[PDB]
Every structure is written in C-alpha cells, then in structure tokens.
Amino acid sequence: VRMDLSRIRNFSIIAHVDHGKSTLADRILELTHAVSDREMREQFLDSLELERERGITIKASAVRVTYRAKDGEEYVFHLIDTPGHVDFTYEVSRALAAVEGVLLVVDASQGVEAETLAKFYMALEHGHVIIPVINKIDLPNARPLEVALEVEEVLGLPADEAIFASGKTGEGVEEILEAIVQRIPPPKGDPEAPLKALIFDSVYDAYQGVIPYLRLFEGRVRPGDRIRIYSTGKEFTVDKVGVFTPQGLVATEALEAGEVGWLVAAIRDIHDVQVGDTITLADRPTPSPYPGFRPAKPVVGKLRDALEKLKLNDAALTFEPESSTALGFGFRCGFLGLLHAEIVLIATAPSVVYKVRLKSGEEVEVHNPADLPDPTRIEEILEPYVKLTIFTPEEYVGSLMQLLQEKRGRLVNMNYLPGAQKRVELVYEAPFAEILYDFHDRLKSVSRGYASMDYEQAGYRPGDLVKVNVLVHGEVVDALTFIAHREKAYTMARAIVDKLAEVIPRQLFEVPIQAAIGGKIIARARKDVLAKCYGGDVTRKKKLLEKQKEGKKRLKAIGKVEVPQEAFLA
Amino acid sequence: MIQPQTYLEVADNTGARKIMCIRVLKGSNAKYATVGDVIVASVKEAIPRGAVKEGDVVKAVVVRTKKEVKRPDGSAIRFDDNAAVIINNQLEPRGTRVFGPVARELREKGFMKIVSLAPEVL
Amino acid sequence: IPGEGHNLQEHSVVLIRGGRVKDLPGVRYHIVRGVYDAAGVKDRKKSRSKYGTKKPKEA
Amino acid sequence: RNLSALKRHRQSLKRRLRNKAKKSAIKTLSKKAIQLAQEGKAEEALKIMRKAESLIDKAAKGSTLHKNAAARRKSRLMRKVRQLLEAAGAPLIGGGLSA
RNA sequence: UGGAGAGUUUGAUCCUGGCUCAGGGUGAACGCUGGCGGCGUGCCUAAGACAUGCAAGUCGUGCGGGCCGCGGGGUUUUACUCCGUGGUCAGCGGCGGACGGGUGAGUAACGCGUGGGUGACCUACCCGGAAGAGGGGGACAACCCGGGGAAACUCGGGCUAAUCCCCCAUGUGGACCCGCCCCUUGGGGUGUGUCCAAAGGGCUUUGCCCGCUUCCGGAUGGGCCCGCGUCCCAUCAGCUAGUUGGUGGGGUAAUGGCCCACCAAGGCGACGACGGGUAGCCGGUCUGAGAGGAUGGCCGGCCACAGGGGCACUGAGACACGGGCCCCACUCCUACGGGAGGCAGCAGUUAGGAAUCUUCCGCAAUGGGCGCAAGCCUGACGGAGCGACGCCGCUU
RNA sequence: UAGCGCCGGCCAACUCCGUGCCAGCAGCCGCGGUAAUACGGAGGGCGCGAGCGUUACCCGGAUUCACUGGGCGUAAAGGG
C-alpha cells in the first residue's frame, strides 16, 4: 500500500471459548469487499467451509484492512487472531507472542474465564498492550455495566476503555478502529536491516510453492531471491509476497518491514519438518530472531502409515510401533482428543509401555505388556514419573490434592506465587500413562478447566504395579493384563473383566471366564427338550435330563477352542 | 409405488440395474412406501469390480409406476421404478446418476444437491 | 534378517533385493540395515557399507 | 477457453447443404433418365443427361466432385442409354450421344 | 588381423554334467561420501488421474461494419454525416487447422523390412508450358427490431458487401459413349453430337503487383496389390455362411463380395492354420573370435491410437491427439434453468509403485504458417535450471 | 573436498588381541566348539578412485543347445 517505513502495528482479539472471535473483523469495515450475493456469510475468513458443521474455526490467517481512517494512517496493522479454546493455543501459540496487543470482547453471558488469565500470561513475555472491550448488545437479559466493571476487579484492569460495541451488529467496533491507532503501540518499520523475520503459520503450496508468510520486522525483501535461516535453508528464487488477501493469491510487490506478507515459491511440496524457527529470510548478517516459536507437549495393513497430513500442527504421535497383543489399532492418538474425524480404528485411550529391569541385569529388555511372559520374579516394574508444575486460580487445590493422589502422589513442593491472586503452584510427581486417563477431563473440572500443566517426568527404582491378568475357561484369553498397582487389581475388574460377554455366546455351555490376574481368581463374570413328556414323571424327566448333562462334561473338554476373541476389546 | 421387499430398480451405484428392497423407514405401521422417502433395501444383481459390493444399505425413492398426486395435481406416471441410494444419514455416494427433471423428488428437501445430478434424458 | 541388530515385529515396512544365504531352503532375501524403520548395527566399524551405517567421527 | 476456429465447422455447415443436395440431384435425374430408359423416351433422358452434365461440372466449378467418378456417372448413365436404345430404341438426337 | 579360464565328488584317480566366479554393459539401484567443469541423459510399472497459465494463424495491398482515435469539414447553431483513415475489436471471406509434441497400449497381420506393381491412380501450394480472364443475377454475418436467458447464449423477421454461389455466354481445349488408326487385359492418336470454362484487388493510369481459371510438362507426395523376410506354446487337430469364386450390379482418387442380389459350391489346413500365450515393428544397440545370441526405449521410418467406442463431414490430402455427431464412464460449474470440458502436448500435482526432472528464459539464429512486404506466433528449439544418473577432463 | 570394498582357497595381498559351536559372514567349498588368518577389534596390505561395493538383468565365458563344433552300448536315454 505504498505505506513505507513507519506506521503499522500489531493487535489481536483473543478471548475465551465461544466469544465471537470472528465478529469484529467480519465485514462492513467500509473497506468495501465480500459481496455479490456470495458474501463471506457468517464466520468468513476462508476457513474451509467444512467447519460449517459448527463454525468451529481452526485458526485466523490473512484478512488485512486498507483504508478506513478519517485521513490518517490509512491502514497499518495486522489482523490475525486464531480462535478456539485451549485447543490450539499452545500449538498455535506461534501467533501468540507474534503481534503486540490483543483485542477481545468479554461474553455478556459466561463472561471472563480461564482462557482470559492464561491468554494474558502470554501478552507479557512478548510485550503487548491490553485491550478490554465488552461486546454483545447486552442481549435480551444481561448487564452492561456490572459485566464490564467485573472484568475490571479480577483482571486488575480499570476503565481502560472498551465500548459495548455490542456483539450482534450493533456498534461493530465503530470506535476501536479510530482508537486502534491511538490505543496501540508501534512495531517500528526500519527501512532496512539484516531481515529479521520469524516463520509464521504453515500454508501448503496449493500446487506450487508453500505459503510461509513472514514479516520483515527489521529489513526489506523482494521476489525471486535467495534465503538462509539457521539451517542454511536450501532454497532459491521465489514469487513476491501478495499478502493474506480475501480470495486467490494477489499481485503487487512483496511485503514490507513489518507488514503481513506470505512467502510463496522456492518450495514445492518439499516437506521435511522444515516448519522453521526464525525469519527464515536472508540477505545479510542479521542475528537470529527472538526464539519465540514453539509449542509444548501433547497434553493428552496400511490406512496411512504416515499421517503427514500436516505434521506442522500434528499433536505428537508418529504412530510409533506399539506392541499390543490385540489388533493394536489406533496408537498414540489419545493425546490430541477433542479433535478427530478425518476421512478414510479404536482409541484404546492409554498405551503406556514403561521400562522393565528384570533381575540378573537385563536392562529395559524392551518393556511392554506382552514382551516375554513372567519368567523370573519381577523387579517391581519401575519406571519414570512427572512432577506437578501448573499454575491455578483461587483455591482449587482442594480438588487437585485429592484427585492428584491418583498414584501415590507425592507433594513435590507446594508453592504460592506472590503479588498474584489465588493463583498457586502445586507440585507432585506421578506416572506417564496414568496421567493419560481420567486426568485431562478432570484437570479442567477439578479447577473448572483453569490453568494448564507442564512437566518433564521423574521417578524410578521402585513402584508397585503387579500384573493383573484374567480368566476365561480356556487360558491366556485374548491379550490383557498389565500392572495392577494400588489395589488396581479389582479396580477395573468389575469393569474390563465384565466385558459384557464377548457379545457372542457360542454354545450353551456357559464357560466361566474369570480373571486369573495372579491368584486366586478375582473377577466373577442348552436345549429345552426336558419339558415335553408333560404332566408327570419327575423321573423320566431326570432320565432325559442327564443325557444332555453328560455332554457338558464331554463338551467343554473336547470342544477345544471355545475362544471367541476379536470382538470389541471392551 | 409402495413396497416391503421387492425387485425395485436401483439405477444407481449398484454394478447392475436392480435392488431388492427391505422396507419403509419411519412410521412402524405404514406398509406403503411413499415416494419422497428413504428406504432399506439391497442389491441382488452383480457388479463390475466397483465398490459398493454385496451387503446391506439404507437409501431413497425415485419415481413410482403407481399413481402420484400433486397438491397442484400435476401428474406423471412411468412403467418403471428406479430409486435413490445414500450413504450415512444423508449424502449420496455415487456422483453419477442419469435421470430427468421430475417433480416430487426434491420436495422432501432434505437433499437438494441431488437434483442437479440427475437432470437428463430418458 | 541379515545383521546383528534385532528389530521390527509383526509389521515393519522395509525393502529387499535378497542374496543367497545358502543355509536354509527357499529363503533368499537379506534386507539391508537402516532402510525405512529397520535399523542398522553400529560399532562394527569397517564394513559399514553393507549393514549400512554412516561413518562416526572416530567416536 | 475461446479457441476460435469453430469457423470451419459452421462455415462448412452451409456447405453440407450445397454440393450434397446437388450430388443428390444427380442421382434423381440420372435415374429419371434411367426411368425414361425403360420407356423409349430417350430424347428426354438425354436432355436430362445434358442437365446431368451440367451438375457434374457445377461440382467441377470448385471443391465438390469429379475424379473418374463423375465420368462414372456419365458413362454409366449413357451406357444405359445405349443398352436400352438397343432395346428397339431407334435413337433420336446426338445431343445425347456421339453421332 | 580374433577366440586365458579356475573351482568344487570321493580314501584316492578319470570321465558325463550340473553348479557358480573371472568380461563388459545397459534409462537403473541402497551404501558411503559427496570439489568443479564439460557432455550426455532421465516413466521402460494403472493407457489412472489429472488445478490453475500455454501450445496455430494472420490476412483493412479480400470484403463491409461495429469500436476509439486524427483533424478537416459535408455543416450556422444544435451538430454530427463525413475526407484521409491512424488504428481497433469481431465478423465474412482466404490458406494451415493431418507437419511439428506424445507415448507404444492393444494388434502376429501385408501392418513394417526388403524388393517389386502402379497396363486398374491422386496430388493443395512447385517451376516450366498453352494460356485464359464477358455479361447477369442472388444470398449471409454483424446492423435494426422483436424473442428466451445470472451470464454465456439462444429465436424469428427486415436490410447489406464482395476473390461467395448461382446465371448463359465464350472456347488455345478438356470429359464420357459409340467408330477408327498405331501398342492389343482402362497404351497412344483421330471420328461427330452433347457436355464444360472462371472475381479482381494492390500500385506510382496503363503498366506494374498478388491472385483468379481449364489444360500440359515433369518435379514432389501419397496410395494401393503382390515376392520374400518377419515371436513361443501341437496337452489348441480341423475350422471357416461375405467364409470361395462366377455373373451383374453397387458405391467408392483408383481394384477387389469393400457391399447387394443372384449363380455356384466351397476354401484353407502337419511346409503349420483355425487357436492360445506374447509383442509397434524395422534403423538398430549390446554381447561375442567368428559362428552366434539377446534385446529394440532417448536419434530415424512408417502404423497405431490418440477419455472408452463408433461414425461420418469438410475437404489438396484425414477418420481429425488444442473439431463435429452420438453413446459409455468421469469431471468440475450452475443463479438449479443449465453447463463446459478431456494434459498418453507442454510445463507441472496426486496416485502409482524402488525408482525418475525447472509451474526456466527467450524470438537471437536455426524450423514452419501467414503476408507482396513490414509484420507476427509458436514451452519447435535454443541455452540455461537440477539427479556423480551415465559419460570425458578436472585438483584435493 | 578422500574414500568404499577387500584379503581360506580359488583369484591378489599378514598378523594381532576379542571372541570361544554363540554371535557369525559367506561367489564356492563352507570356515569357527576356549591358542580360529573366513567372527569381533586394531594395524597392515590390496584394489580402484571421487566414486567404490551393491543386487537385477544381459549375453559372454559355455562345445552347459551342437549348422560351424557335440553325444546318446554300462555313465542321461534305441521306441517291443
């Protein structure tokens, strides 16, 4: 837009779950666009239409404004603000500490929440300006003052402006705009420098050249040129950036020194986990960029064999190997959660392998739940662990410290940050797999889904676990049993053991498949000829009653197999 | 027009032009298989390699070969009885279906996209 | 399985030309190390080429 | 999308009229002579034979018809004229035959 | 004028033979590494798909407008009809849309080889040649208008040009039937009667300049019909009803059952069919003393298809890979009435599968097409892009 | 910017400690069960060379398809 050095900015409208993070920048911005009967409809911004199922926008890319200022800066500031709710934040964090400041109107209904506090914890490490703006036309029933002032007592922010622009139509940021330039800082648009420019969101090549839209924070760039970022970057000439327009690629020269231009060309499908970690762009001797890019952990006959559909966003599970007696099926897929349903298995929830150290010195020996039956006295399983290091609001520890003992929890070292408010810092070591079941869902409920967590594991040497098995007339059954730790023997007994009944019965023998976990059994899971000689003989009845009765003793014995496995595994 | 099981024409994604029916899909008692309806049924005839293969399926009406009425009393008969096929709740497997314009079809208005896909002659 | 490095299970994609292992009938195929998810023994300093492994930097 | 040569087709479409009907006419006229050939009205058949000549070279005027085949039509038709003049024809004009 | 071996049996030895190695090499390949330069070269596995851009025209020195300009005016104004037209979009009319780019599937056969046959032919534009070159009438696009339509388009009526068609002259002559001479299966010459000819425009105004025309000369191209050559299976041993010939006819650049009716009764087959498997094929390349064998992609030759299948049309010349018509699968688009399309062209994406390529750069010459010339196009080609992928040289 | 393979014998070029009927490589015979020249480790030599093994195929070699150039009584087979 000719807008040389100076001007521009960095603002984002981030908020909690379901808050219309796509309302403000919807349209009617005077900029003139999106129309002709084919308006961007409800929840514009490309997206994928597929989300139409529930307008569950994944991320916010492109969408930049031009003219709209009563003869001023004209147009100089980003407009990217991925939505969601603690479902892509961490992973999408790459955009968090990217653009200074972040707008977002508080929900007149639910109002402020966890996503608010945690969302702010990032608006600091980067350095942005707070933006409190309560949207929603107050709706039929709802308070505008109380609700507004509310986020002023807890958030600690006072009448820092906002304006009830109202969610549905209403004002429509009819104030923030002319205020944005006034209520925002500058990102400095140096005419030239050694091209500082950290990698942004991945965008496939569509059919030729990926979309690594960058942002010359301090320098200039053109089209069809060279590039080099840390990992050298084996690339060459590339098309000039057109900017995140509304439709197909645009024209015009490349971006500027801080603008929001996408880097096309140079790369063609050549996918090699080269997500990036810096400006990627080259031209001189510019120190690396603020390593402000990274996600975190996972939190939670073919088919594919390479779900490389987009490793860039992939939670964390390259399928690995997984040694499951059953049909293995889905592997390391219980981490992503909430997210699923692709196109063309069974989520066995957890699948921890652990590390075994058989006596006589046999190292890990490839730990597993079916790797070499028990030949010698186990060495007490033994494995690692994970400490507790995740902030929290108010006094939610009561529910944590209680449920935390899910596995002989050990108060690593309770703490209480100062200056804050209620936010605490509890700590407790535990296992890996265990923290994968009946934890996530609880992690939120227990504290109302407030604050997250992050550890590195820890713990070894001892640690009960045993090896709870099962029984089923036959023997060995399918392939269950693992390590019943902490009375965990019967804990799941009346659960998994009582596997309904294998759906299939097969014959009328009624075999009693118990649970030979390691006892001492634990779990506790025919023709009608008899009545035909009617009206008499509690004698002859018995005669024909023994006939079949003898078969049972000669059936279950001779009738080998009787194993109807491969049912549902539940 | 109406049918429990029967020979009824599929003309769809079967590898041959027939499906055996099973029955009406909604009202318990109904007997009658009214048009503008989805149905349970199965092919009996063969396929060229194809995809859908043998098994069971739920899916919908085309035509009648037994007296319709319109509210505007438009009328239209046809000594033949093709009917629609569907995957899941709703969407149409084959992206191909030769057939004509016709009237009652869209009127359930649960599956508008189909209309385009069977417009033509014969 | 040529080599000294046990690996892989009920399934493991790799690839294979073969070569006589004039010891047992019909079997005729020595899959090379490190290709795909099959691994490769190390320590076996010279003759890394077959039983593929890159050269360690004298370490 | 707008390759333009559709030209030839549509243009040639008027042609597919042209000659074709013209060619067709030759048949009719020919057999009329042949029709006439049955009945001793040879003078008639040869006046029409004349007309046949005319259509022949009308075809000749451009890219229509000729080769030997035009003369196939000629020599055939007139040959028929001659075999039925054999049928007690007692022939009239040389306008339909070399003297 | 070019032809190396050894080894392994059994207590030992020698034969018959089997095993595998020493030779080289090919569109390759994991493995390690990996400096450059030069050259060569890269879909042989679903003949699946395939998105966006791009592969064939330019003619106003053919013809008439719409369309913007140039300036004068024909014109006082209000203006616009116009003088050059400068251009320009479309259209009409011209010649190219068959040659180039592809890959080689299916076919074993006269398709190709190789040679003849062409006494059963044809050539657009080639030079050489005899030339020849009048009157007359008539339609179409757009234009006007109505008519349907989200658009595109679709529909009637009315006008209008001309190298467009028709109109009868006009014949240096050409075509056939019958008759001839001279060679004798539709050879070459004479015989009467019919039949038959066809714009001008460009320029410097009478000459030029391009064309227009029948006929001839050969050039050139193609065509068919045969000689011979042309892959493995005889646990495929008899099969063939346009199947085999005759009449006569039919249509065809040209014969022939190519087709029909009819007359006849066959007709081929152990020299190897009727089958089955398997395959563009020859240039060739590779092996190798030779004999010889194997293979046949990049380079050349035709056929072959050029979504599957088929049929014709124009037309100098086809069964038409960036055409028509229709079925058969498929595609995406629709405003839901309808559409519109075919990357085995380019470049390039997915699926494939071990495996394979820059959404280059360019009109420069070389090549074609136009055009009287300027001019103008072409992922032909060009060089460059990248894979020690091969190959030659190259330092470490 | 120097590296890969190679070393019983064929068909080139040595030992060494490890190992100790395992773990083994292997054109071909196979070579090794507590002193292994083939197995690990070094070191050396050898080989070619920025390319070395690498299978696959191709024919050669090989007279192991034979017209040139063969054999077929007991070795494979003469038809009753």
Ligand SMILES: Nc1nc2c(ncn2[C@@H]2O[C@H](COP(=O)(O)OP(=O)(O)CP(=O)(O)O)[C@@H](O)[C@H]2O)c(=O)[nH]1
């Ligand atoms: N009654 C009402 N509805 C509102 C208001 N503001 C937004 N909405 C509605 O709620 C819907 C969701 O709001 P929005 O935040 O923009 O979408 P989203 O919550 O971000 C969904 P995603 O996170 O996937 O992008 C919107 O489709 C909009 O129609 C409001 O003030 N009142």
